[PDB]
Coordinates of C-alpha atoms in Angstrom, one line a residue:
Chain C
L571 CA -23.4 9.9 43.3
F572 CA -24.7 12.9 41.4
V573 CA -22.7 12.7 38.2
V574 CA -22.5 8.5 38.8
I575 CA -26.8 9.2 38.2
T576 CA -26.4 11.4 35.6
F577 CA -24.2 8.7 33.6
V578 CA -26.5 6.2 34.4
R579 CA -29.5 7.6 33.6
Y580 CA -27.8 9.4 30.9
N581 CA -26.2 6.2 29.1
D582 CA -26.4 6.4 25.8
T583 CA -25.6 10.1 24.8
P584 CA -23.0 11.0 22.2
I585 CA -21.0 12.7 25.3
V586 CA -21.0 10.6 27.5
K587 CA -19.8 8.1 24.3
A588 CA -16.9 10.2 23.8
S589 CA -16.6 9.8 27.6
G590 CA -15.5 6.4 27.1
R591 CA -18.4 5.4 29.4
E592 CA -17.4 2.2 31.9
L593 CA -13.6 2.9 32.2
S594 CA -14.9 6.2 33.3
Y595 CA -17.1 4.7 36.1
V596 CA -14.5 3.0 37.6
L597 CA -12.7 6.5 37.0
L598 CA -15.7 8.4 39.3
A599 CA -15.9 5.0 41.6
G600 CA -11.8 5.7 42.1
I601 CA -12.9 9.4 43.2
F602 CA -15.7 7.4 45.5
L603 CA -13.2 5.4 47.6
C604 CA -11.0 8.0 47.9
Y605 CA -13.4 10.3 48.8
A606 CA -14.7 7.6 51.4
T607 CA -10.8 7.3 53.1
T608 CA -11.1 10.8 54.5
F609 CA -14.6 8.9 56.1
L610 CA -12.6 6.3 57.3
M611 CA -9.6 8.7 58.4
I612 CA -11.5 10.2 61.2
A613 CA -13.1 7.4 63.1
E614 CA -10.8 6.0 65.7
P615 CA -8.4 4.1 64.7
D616 CA -8.9 0.5 66.1
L617 CA -7.5 -2.2 64.7
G618 CA -9.6 -2.5 61.6
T619 CA -9.8 0.9 60.2
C620 CA -5.7 1.5 61.1
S621 CA -5.3 -2.1 58.0
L622 CA -8.1 -0.1 55.7
Chain T
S6 CA 3.6 -40.1 12.0
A7 CA 7.1 -39.6 11.7
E8 CA 6.9 -38.2 8.2
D9 CA 2.9 -36.2 9.4
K10 CA 5.3 -34.2 11.6
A11 CA 6.5 -32.2 9.0
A12 CA 3.5 -32.0 6.9
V13 CA 2.6 -30.3 10.6
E14 CA 5.8 -28.3 9.7
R15 CA 4.7 -27.3 6.2
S16 CA 1.2 -26.5 7.7
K17 CA 2.3 -24.0 10.5
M18 CA 4.6 -22.7 7.7
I19 CA 2.2 -22.1 5.8
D20 CA -0.5 -20.6 8.7
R21 CA 2.5 -18.1 9.3
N22 CA 2.7 -16.3 5.9
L23 CA -1.2 -16.8 5.7
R24 CA -1.1 -14.4 8.9
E25 CA 1.4 -12.4 7.9
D26 CA 0.0 -11.3 4.3
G27 CA -3.5 -11.2 5.9
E28 CA -2.3 -8.6 8.7
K29 CA -0.5 -6.9 5.9
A30 CA -3.8 -6.8 2.9
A31 CA -6.1 -5.7 6.6
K32 CA -3.5 -2.7 7.2
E33 CA -4.7 -0.9 3.7
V34 CA -7.6 0.5 2.7
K35 CA -9.9 -0.7 -0.2
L36 CA -11.6 1.6 -1.9
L37 CA -14.7 1.1 -4.5
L38 CA -14.2 3.3 -7.8
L39 CA -18.4 4.0 -9.9
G40 CA -20.5 5.4 -11.4
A41 CA -22.0 6.4 -14.8
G42 CA -20.4 5.5 -18.5
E43 CA -18.3 9.1 -19.6
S44 CA -18.9 10.3 -15.5
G45 CA -14.8 11.4 -16.1
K46 CA -13.4 8.6 -13.8
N47 CA -10.5 8.3 -15.8
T48 CA -9.1 11.5 -15.1
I49 CA -9.9 11.0 -11.1
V50 CA -7.8 7.7 -11.7
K51 CA -5.1 9.2 -13.9
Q52 CA -4.8 12.0 -10.5
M53 CA -4.1 9.4 -8.0
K54 CA -2.1 6.9 -10.1
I55 CA 0.1 10.2 -10.9
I56 CA 0.0 10.6 -7.1
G183 CA -12.2 -7.1 -15.8
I184 CA -11.5 -5.4 -12.4
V185 CA -9.2 -2.6 -12.7
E186 CA -6.9 -2.5 -9.1
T187 CA -5.1 0.2 -9.2
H188 CA -2.4 1.1 -6.4
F189 CA -1.0 4.2 -4.9
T190 CA 0.7 5.3 -1.8
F191 CA -0.3 9.0 0.2
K192 CA 1.8 9.4 2.9
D193 CA 1.8 5.7 4.2
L194 CA -1.4 4.2 4.4
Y195 CA -0.6 2.4 1.0
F196 CA -4.4 2.1 -1.0
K197 CA -5.8 -0.2 -3.6
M198 CA -8.4 1.1 -5.6
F199 CA -11.4 -0.6 -7.9
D200 CA -12.3 0.1 -11.3
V201 CA -15.4 -2.2 -11.5
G202 CA -17.3 0.2 -14.8
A203 CA -15.6 -2.4 -16.7
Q204 CA -18.5 -5.1 -15.6
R205 CA -21.6 -4.5 -17.8
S206 CA -23.4 -7.6 -16.3
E207 CA -26.1 -7.7 -13.0
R208 CA -24.9 -5.6 -10.2
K209 CA -27.3 -7.5 -7.7
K210 CA -25.2 -10.8 -7.5
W211 CA -21.9 -8.7 -7.6
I212 CA -21.9 -6.0 -5.3
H213 CA -22.4 -8.9 -2.6
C214 CA -19.1 -8.5 -2.9
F215 CA -17.0 -5.5 -1.9
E216 CA -18.6 -5.1 1.8
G217 CA -15.8 -4.4 3.4
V218 CA -14.2 -1.3 1.3
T219 CA -14.0 1.3 3.9
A220 CA -14.7 3.6 0.7
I221 CA -16.6 4.2 -1.7
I222 CA -15.9 6.9 -4.6
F223 CA -18.4 7.9 -6.6
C224 CA -17.5 9.8 -9.8
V225 CA -20.8 11.8 -11.6
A226 CA -19.6 14.2 -14.2
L227 CA -22.0 17.5 -13.7
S228 CA -22.1 18.3 -17.6
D229 CA -24.5 15.1 -17.5
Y230 CA -27.1 17.3 -16.7
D231 CA -27.5 18.7 -20.6
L232 CA -27.4 15.2 -22.5
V233 CA -30.4 13.7 -23.3
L234 CA -29.3 10.3 -23.5
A235 CA -27.0 7.4 -23.4
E236 CA -28.5 4.7 -25.2
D237 CA -30.7 4.7 -22.9
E238 CA -34.3 5.5 -24.4
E239 CA -33.7 9.4 -23.6
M240 CA -33.0 8.8 -19.8
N241 CA -31.0 12.2 -18.9
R242 CA -27.6 10.7 -17.8
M243 CA -27.7 12.5 -14.9
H244 CA -30.8 10.7 -13.7
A245 CA -30.0 8.0 -15.0
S246 CA -26.6 8.2 -12.3
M247 CA -29.0 9.3 -9.4
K248 CA -30.7 6.7 -9.9
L249 CA -27.2 4.2 -9.7
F250 CA -26.5 6.3 -7.4
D251 CA -30.1 5.5 -4.9
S252 CA -29.5 1.7 -6.0
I253 CA -26.2 1.4 -4.8
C254 CA -25.9 3.9 -1.8
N255 CA -28.9 2.4 0.1
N256 CA -28.3 -1.5 -0.5
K257 CA -28.4 -3.4 2.6
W258 CA -24.7 -4.6 1.8
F259 CA -23.4 -1.3 1.9
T260 CA -24.4 0.0 5.6
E261 CA -21.3 1.3 7.5
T262 CA -19.9 2.0 3.9
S263 CA -19.1 5.7 2.8
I264 CA -19.7 7.2 0.0
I265 CA -17.0 9.7 -1.7
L266 CA -18.8 11.5 -3.7
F267 CA -16.8 13.4 -6.9
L268 CA -19.3 15.8 -8.5
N269 CA -16.0 16.0 -12.1
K270 CA -16.0 18.7 -14.6
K271 CA -17.1 21.9 -11.9
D272 CA -15.1 23.5 -15.2
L273 CA -17.3 21.7 -17.7
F274 CA -20.1 22.3 -16.0
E275 CA -19.5 26.5 -14.9
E276 CA -19.5 26.8 -19.2
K277 CA -22.5 25.0 -19.3
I278 CA -24.5 26.1 -16.7
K279 CA -23.9 30.1 -18.1
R280 CA -27.2 29.1 -20.7
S281 CA -28.9 26.2 -20.8
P282 CA -30.5 26.1 -17.3
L283 CA -30.5 23.8 -15.2
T284 CA -34.8 23.4 -15.2
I285 CA -34.0 21.4 -18.1
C286 CA -32.8 18.7 -15.6
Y287 CA -34.6 19.6 -12.0
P288 CA -38.3 21.4 -13.6
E289 CA -38.3 22.1 -9.4
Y290 CA -34.9 24.3 -9.5
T291 CA -35.7 28.3 -9.1
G292 CA -32.4 29.8 -8.3
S293 CA -30.5 32.4 -11.0
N294 CA -28.4 29.9 -12.4
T295 CA -25.8 30.9 -11.1
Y296 CA -22.7 28.6 -10.5
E297 CA -22.3 28.0 -6.9
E298 CA -26.5 27.9 -6.8
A299 CA -26.6 25.4 -9.1
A300 CA -23.8 23.3 -7.9
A301 CA -24.7 23.3 -4.2
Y302 CA -28.4 22.1 -5.2
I303 CA -27.2 18.9 -6.9
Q304 CA -24.7 18.4 -4.1
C305 CA -27.5 18.7 -2.0
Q306 CA -30.0 16.6 -4.2
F307 CA -27.1 14.3 -4.2
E308 CA -26.9 13.9 -0.7
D309 CA -30.4 14.1 0.4
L310 CA -30.8 10.9 -2.6
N311 CA -29.2 9.1 0.5
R312 CA -31.9 7.9 3.2
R313 CA -30.1 6.2 5.8
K314 CA -28.2 9.5 6.8
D315 CA -27.9 8.1 10.0
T316 CA -25.4 5.6 10.2
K317 CA -23.7 6.5 6.1
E318 CA -22.1 9.8 5.0
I319 CA -21.4 11.4 2.2
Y320 CA -18.2 13.2 1.2
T321 CA -19.0 15.7 -1.4
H322 CA -16.2 17.3 -3.3
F323 CA -16.1 19.3 -6.6
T324 CA -13.3 18.0 -9.4
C325 CA -11.7 19.0 -12.3
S326 CA -9.4 18.2 -15.0
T327 CA -6.5 19.5 -13.0
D328 CA -4.1 18.7 -9.9
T329 CA -6.8 19.3 -7.3
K330 CA -6.6 18.2 -3.5
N331 CA -8.7 15.4 -5.0
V332 CA -5.8 12.6 -4.0
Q333 CA -5.3 14.5 -0.7
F334 CA -8.9 14.7 0.0
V335 CA -9.4 11.0 -0.7
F336 CA -6.8 10.7 2.0
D337 CA -8.5 12.8 4.5
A338 CA -12.4 11.4 4.2
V339 CA -10.3 7.3 4.5
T340 CA -8.5 8.5 7.2
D341 CA -11.9 10.1 8.8
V342 CA -13.9 7.2 8.2
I343 CA -11.3 4.8 9.6
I344 CA -11.5 7.0 12.2
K345 CA -14.8 6.5 12.7
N346 CA -15.0 3.1 11.9
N347 CA -12.5 2.2 15.2
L348 CA -14.6 4.7 17.1
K349 CA -17.6 2.3 16.7
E350 CA -15.2 -0.6 17.5
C351 CA -15.0 0.2 21.0
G352 CA -18.0 2.8 21.2
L353 CA -16.7 5.7 21.8
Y354 CA -18.4 7.7 19.1

């Protein structure tokens, strides 16, 4: 979230240009989802959780 | 429309040829060539060729170059230079030996200031914003031979350097590059050349390659 809000508020400096912009935002949201996988795993198996 | 199907066939074949030739031409790089009279553009064009509008074709490791020599047109540049808007290089040739010369049939206007005035008119023209200028400070040897005696102050009264060659040519480069106002977007690739086998073709190749990459990185917003 810190890196997301850093790019979001610095969305115009030549190094975020060099980072490719929104393709990098896609990468970083992918990292966010890969992290939330851990939050999802420790929960009770139930039925929906095992599917997700 | 039994025969008009053949007409559509002709149209499709012509469109195919059109697209192939168009992509072949858009493959190639277009370089303007301009400068004052006797700026030494002949020597420069001879070097790249060894490796109305006069079109000269040369290749340097693919990336086939077409060069357009325009000095031949004594006419209104304002209504002509609205063309050449798609050139990815504007080779400007100026001879540093012009600093010493008072006249070019132009009311004792110093040839150097005449060249700078033409450079100002062409670099800042609003047709050319993304096109990059490659600056050939030609005849570096004859300048080095002249500066040893005749002070650059005859051309640039505010110059206070020791008339040593490096401190003079660096001043001319600094002045020509500071003459470009829209430096935020435009780039000036100043180089020193003379009548010898320099890397001027290699330098044109490198500057053109860099400008191409800069343009493409603007296309995707990476730069």
